[PDB]
Amino acid sequence: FSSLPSYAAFATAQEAYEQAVANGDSEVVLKKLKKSLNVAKSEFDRDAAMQRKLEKMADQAMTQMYKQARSEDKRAKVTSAMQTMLFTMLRKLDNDALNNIINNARDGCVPLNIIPLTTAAKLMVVIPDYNTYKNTCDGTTFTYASALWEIQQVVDADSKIVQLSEISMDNSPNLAWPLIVTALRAN
Amino acid sequence: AVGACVLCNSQTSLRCGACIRRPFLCCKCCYDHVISTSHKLVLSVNPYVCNAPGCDVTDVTQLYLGGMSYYCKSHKPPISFPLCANGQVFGLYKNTCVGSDNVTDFNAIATCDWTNAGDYILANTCTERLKLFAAETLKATEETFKLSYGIATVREVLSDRELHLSWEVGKPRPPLNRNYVFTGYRVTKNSKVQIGEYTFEKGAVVYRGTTTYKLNVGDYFVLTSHTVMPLSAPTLVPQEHYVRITGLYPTLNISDEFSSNVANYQKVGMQKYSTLQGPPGTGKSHFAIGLALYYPSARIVYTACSHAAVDALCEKALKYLPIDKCSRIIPAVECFDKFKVNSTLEQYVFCTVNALPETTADIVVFDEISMATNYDLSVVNARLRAKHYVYIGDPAQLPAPRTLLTKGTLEPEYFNSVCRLMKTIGPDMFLGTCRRCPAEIVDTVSALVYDNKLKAHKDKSAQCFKMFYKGVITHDVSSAINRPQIGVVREFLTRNPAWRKAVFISPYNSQNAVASKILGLPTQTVDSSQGSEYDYVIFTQTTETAHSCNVNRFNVAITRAKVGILCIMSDRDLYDKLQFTSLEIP
Amino acid sequence: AVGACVLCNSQTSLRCGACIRRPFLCCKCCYDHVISTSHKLVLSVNPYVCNAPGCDVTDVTQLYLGGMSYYCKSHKPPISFPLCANGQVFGLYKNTCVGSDNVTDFNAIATCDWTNAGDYILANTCTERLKLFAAETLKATEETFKLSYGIATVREVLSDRELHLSWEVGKPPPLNRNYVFTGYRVTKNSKVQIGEYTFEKGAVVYRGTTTYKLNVGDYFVLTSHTVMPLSAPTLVPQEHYVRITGLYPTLNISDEFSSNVANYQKVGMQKYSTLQGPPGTGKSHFAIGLALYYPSARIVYTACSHAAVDALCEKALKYLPIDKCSRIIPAVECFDKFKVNSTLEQYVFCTVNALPETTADIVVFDEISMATNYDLSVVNARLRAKHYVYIGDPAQLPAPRTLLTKGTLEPEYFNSVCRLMKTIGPDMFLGTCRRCPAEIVDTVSALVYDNKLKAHKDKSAQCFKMFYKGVITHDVSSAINRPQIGVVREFLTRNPAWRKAVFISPYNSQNAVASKILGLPTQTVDSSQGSEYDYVIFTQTTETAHSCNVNRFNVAITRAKVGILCIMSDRDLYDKLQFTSLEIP
RNA sequence: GCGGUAGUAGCAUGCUAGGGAGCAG
RNA sequence: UGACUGCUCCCUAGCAUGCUACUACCG
Ligand SMILES: [Zn+2]
Ligand SMILES: [Zn+2]
Ligand SMILES: [Zn+2]
Ligand SMILES: [Zn+2]
Ligand SMILES: [Zn+2]
Ligand SMILES: [Zn+2]
């Protein structure tokens, strides 16, 4: 309140009225002793009820503008994370076996369900039981999707390496059974 | 929108507009640079302007706050608030405020329209951050002055070495010479298609580059101005004298390529930075080759600034150096591809400032510092920051192509920070052993500025010829001509068998092109031809004004030839301070 | 997070924020610690910080708690009360507070470098728990300063025995490799097993402790854990037990010792005891005695290192069953000789590093010198035994007091176990003058151990003495002594049996360099734990400050059996000592 | 004697936001 | 790892209205 431009009048009117109490004041000067700090006090309160509103308004943009900054800084951290993805899932397209089906296409459009089926290098087979295993993945090589795949690893549900000799007809009760066979393309 | 006040570095959120590049002036510091200049606009997280119906009132200094938008006096809501007041513009982080007594330079740097030498004098007496800001804004104003050119529309072509080109209406013809490489980009239907690196000859038309494009219909020739990136890393670091040799391994034997290089290792390996102050043709091209081989256990790099000057660094490289052991970089601008490309792991890297890989090193060389602006040093330090580096070059050479200053000449010291810091505290070295050069240049540069500290080595056989022909200059159009030059050259080769296998120097490429159209001479650059000087050369008058030949242009041009130096007087040039032979013209 | 202000014994929930260990301070310690000492930060269940976008005024100064959070002055949503007011700080337990009369504890110890003499001497006049906290703050300051040092690395693999190493540039680098450097390696982005390396000599010669495989770029840096809080005192009040009831004494009694039944009955009717024992004072063979005499007694045996355990374990399996010991190994120098991974026995040995807490009945440890109260507290909290027989000596091989800046304090004023003894008196009589000769015992019991040991065995007039002043010549980073090693070598040639000793020296580089032309194995000085041998070559320097300051190596003289070699350049330890004096040639 | 006007404190209603929790398809 | 909607109780901060006393000028 030490810089409000209505402190001078209030201060002076207080001094004139209050400080001059000991001195004999007649009933005519008493009006000046009374109706001089009055009105001035009203105006000061008016000069303080507007300052309090300007302060709050001000401290509602120095908070709503930190939030406009925060979000743009964030908008630049996700815009650079999707970019770092769509350029890492691209360096992975064996562009000899992929430009060989987009080319044999009538216009260059192909179904998406035949891209991993004809242009992939690895196969993952998930097998529930032993009966399913001998009709799908018997031996070290097997044919699927008009191709030939050679087994490379057989992990299990626990993710521990199984060998192709632990898989018997009677040792089967001793394996975590969802078995995951990883195979590579041949030729 | 929150960063370092160009000046105080504290975090701000503001940023002027006057400043084309738009730096992050802090809070307080805006009160100086905002009121103390035409610079008024301001942009913080949100832009400042009377959001009131299509208004047009700005100068924040006058604009007031209120509500949640801003309003100057335009229509300030009852609950307004001066946006501008107590030395501070309302902006994020207000207590970290500080500002600094630095609006001094800051204000001259901001206000400097870059027309007189005083712009460069005041730009060169400031602090590190002010220096960076001044270099950035200088490059900005120069490129945005340079892009003020139209397009060249081409629809047909007759044959090779011929083309009918015409600039737009109201736009003058872009300058003749090749200092502004014509990297054009035509259009096919929607985007920019490649053209190639080009350069003009005259308004016959010989293409001195190495490329071939199928030009025809719809071709658009343009001048490409790259969007400059903001500079971050400093251009230098204060040094400190140590005692312990860390990492460096002196060789068990002596690579006695040179004799004085032992003092070079004794004087250079101690301090954190130095400079090879070598006179022209006194070992300014292959001392770094010796330092490369005397310290094989230290990572050593070389950067350059021009594609032309790669002759000396390549000939001895094939003569006595391997291919695989070195490394080169070229993107897909154009240069030799003899060596290994794309090899971040090597001991002898050659590279140019156009593009470098982010890596650190311990010893670098930086050829032609005198051609390079402070921005070039700062960018080559930011892209590749290494422990020690040496700036190949000498201040006593030609100025950089600063076409922004015309009336006033450019003194050496104000070329860059190094070309004065090395004058004040003293040069770090001085050489006087010219490998392959007569002592004429030795005497000349000893009398001029060396004060006769290095003396004549080879006998002055008085084989240099100088005459008293002045010539007459005349200007007609944007390109200039010299009538007493088509005949003067013929009058000088009338009966001299020795220079029938000589080259031609081209201070002004226009006159050289005209004379080659009349008679026919190979074109040779003046600026980017240091170290490529032929044995037998002729110096032509070629000019009569103060535009190029005032003091510091002939020092490297009178030492091109080895045995026969015929350098005719062209102006009041030192004529009555020494003696000179003279063949009497018929 | 409800700890305890043991500066008052008050139960609180605050802690000083910008402080060493961030300990629990009450509303009456954390009131005056912040105003005088600038620790304008307190930590509670939630930190006392502003809670409004961007604020950077975090000082529990006049912060006001309102609207379920701590706001600030500058921007004022005041409508609340300040956090610090009426001689207290806000927080739980704001009513049940006691206060402290010693205001300047943190004001004196939380700002200094934890090395001043005044701090130590006022610490040694504190209570047991405050001094436990002082020792934990000494460990914590050591570990805090452990991450303000350098890092080694190798970026270029060279031929064996000739490598190069750079540590750092322009920072304040000496370190008596005491605890050696085992960092971990890197190849491209992950961690790779490297092992443990030892750098003693140092293009730069490299020795090899064990075969390894260097890779490009391998770094070396040490990471140390934080000492956890303990819940047990160090010393115990004196309280004589009722009787020797509850024990299983044995019918047979030893006869080669004439002070065995008396001390057995004494420990029977005594609870805790401390002594001042030099090497070879009952630690060698009396542990086996109490082992055989007291079979059912759960005797725990531990040393500060496995190498002092080896001294008793070597012969502890000949007279007694092999299974009588049991130590655990982690997965420090050791060896897998015993039955490991067996923490159940009657004579379960122990280790300072780690061991599970099951049961104990008798306290007997070996040298407990190279540590502060930390060792006593960790061994009292790890296991609480009925009887305490503290073998060893509080001042035998003391831990180096990190960075010394102000001289060295007088041994008399140690942490807890030296001033109590020489202010109340010895408790028990014990001495083994079998190994040690009298020439050492006389002076050692003349200096500090008056009337404690008797001159049992005579001297064969072999001790070497020659007053040589010599000339010292220091350099920028080291110094090499020409005169004294040369005269020592010249004296050694005069006896034919002198090439079966070791090469031990105060400095590792000196003896390492000097062994390249004599051919002697490298040895250093960290702790000669339970390792006594006949021949030895002793040295010092830099005397003045590092060697000739106090009797840091008086007990350490007792390793030999029929004579030792210990030259000295001063006139304070030979005023009555009778080493054979001879003149140089 | 009364009315109007502008601040201040105190008690309930509705609405707009944030936070924690419960149920239903 | 934690979807889309709807209803509802409790606590805190802000805005306007509703009967009063206090101020002070004005009638
Ligand atoms: Zn501006
Ligand atoms: Zn407006
Ligand atoms: Zn600033
Ligand atoms: Zn603290
Ligand atoms: Zn307390
Ligand atoms: Zn706040």
Swiss-Prot record, chain A:
This is Non-structural protein 8. It comes from the Viruses. Interacts with nsp7, nsp13 and nsp12 to form the replication-transcription complex (RTC): nsp12, nsp7, two subunits of nsp8, and up to two subunits of nsp13. Eight copies of nsp7 and eight copies of nsp8 assemble to form a heterohexadecamer dsRNA-encircling ring structure. The chain holds residues 3948 to 4134 of 7096 of the full protein. Residues 1-187 form the RdRp Nsp8 cofactor domain. LRR repeats lie at residues 30-57. Residues 1-73 are annotated as: Disordered. It is found in: Host cytoplasm, Host perinuclear region; Host cytoplasm; Host endoplasmic reticulum. Plays a role in viral RNA synthesis. Forms a hexadecamer with nsp7 (8 subunits of each) that may participate in viral replication by acting as a primase. Alternatively, may synthesize substantially longer products than oligonucleotide primers. Interacts with ribosome signal recognition particle RNA (SRP). Together with NSP9, suppress protein integration into the cell membrane, thereby disrupting host immune defenses. The gene is rep.
